[PDB]
Structure 1
Amino acid sequence: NKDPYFMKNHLGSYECKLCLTLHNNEGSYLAHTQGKKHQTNLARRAAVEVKKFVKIGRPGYKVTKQRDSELFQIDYPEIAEGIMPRHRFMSAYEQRIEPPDRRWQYLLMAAEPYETIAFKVPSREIDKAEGKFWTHWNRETKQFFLQ
């Protein structure tokens, strides 16, 4: 059968390792399985709300890039909320139409009353897209900067 205790030795006689027993044929082993010894040996071995309420009118954003050396400026209107716009780097493998030859990355900045503005980065790593590291959001002038 499929039980690991039943096996075939080099001699070819059947043998139950669970009971340490030898049987001449299959019927003797099956009669041993119904016996007290095999049952006792087996008994011994037995032991969402914020995403749906977000308004999307998709206004026209104003991004200004500048090649620095040692940084993009996004002009956004007044949102009147404490939620800062967040930037994140994603891949071009997921799209609404999935165009061919998409093997680059895109850093996109998104806010709640405005639409996300995305910029493609052909380079591998030239900066850091972390939010708390190299980003700033002045709510007095409503200016977003990321370097």
Structure 2
Amino acid sequence: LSKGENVPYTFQDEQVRSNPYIYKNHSGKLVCKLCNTMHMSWSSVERHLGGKKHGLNVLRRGISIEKXXXXXXXXXXXXXXXXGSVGLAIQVNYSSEVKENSVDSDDKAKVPPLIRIVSGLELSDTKQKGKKFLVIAYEPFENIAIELPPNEILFSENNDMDNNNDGVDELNKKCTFWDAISKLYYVQ
């Protein structure tokens, strides 16, 4: 059952071993140095190797081994209404190929204007606050804001049928249009 292999004694001061684990101590018995278990016969040794006990100690031993031009554009606010409530609509116009003739290197040129709702709680001056602003931004031109005293207007409920191209946010895809051919940004 030993398959003719020679297992040297533990005290013989270590030829490569099949398993460098099962040894024979000062006595004739066979032992697993990791498991610290004594085994009478080589059959018992093979039961030990095929047993889950020895394997667990092998995994434990492996774990031990591992151990900006700012130019104000022109806005055109206008009180709108549909059905069934009231909403706001803004018409922002941009340059007429006047200065954009020097910059055309596909650097976010494909990116349309972006809007975000900002709380006045944070300002460069920090004096008064308590209302929101519908900020609109484009790379070269300067940012623009619109005060929204009303807690909620035109804040709709599942307008479209839940299609998921987040773009920037639900606000932008939900209610903005960018006439890039004429350079007119509508928001409502």
- TM-score, structure 1 as length reference: 0.59
Q: CA separation in 1, counterparts of 2:112 and 2:80?
A: 24
Instruction: Give the aligned partner of residue 74 of structure 2.
Output: 62
Unaligned runs of 5+ in 1: 1-55
Aligned alpha-carbon RMSD (Å): 1.5
Q: CA separation in 2, counterparts of 1:143 and 1:122?
A: 26
Please, which of 94, 116, 120 is the counterpart of residue 147 of structure 2?
Answer: 120
Instruction: Give the aligned partner of residue 18 of structure 2.
Output: none
Please tell me the residue identity of whatever aligns with 1:91: S
Equivalences for residues 18-97 of structure 1 within 5 A: 56-70=68-82, 71-77=89-95, 81-97=109-125
Instruction: Give the aligned partner of residue 130 of structure 2.
Output: 103
Greater strand fraction, Structure 1 or Structure 2: 1
Please tell me the residue identity of whatever aligns with 1:146: V
4+ aligned runs moved over 4 Å, structure 1: none
Q: CA separation in 2, counterparts of 1:60 and 1:88?
A: 17
Q: Give 1:127 shift.
A: 2.4
Identity %, equivalent residues = 24
Instruction: Give the aligned partner of residue 130 of structure 1.
Output: 171
Q: Give 1:60 shift.
A: 2.1
Q: Give 1:136 shift.
A: 0.3
Instruction: Give the aligned partner of residue 3 of structure 2.
Output: none
Q: CA separation in 2, counterparts of 1:65 and 1:91?
A: 20
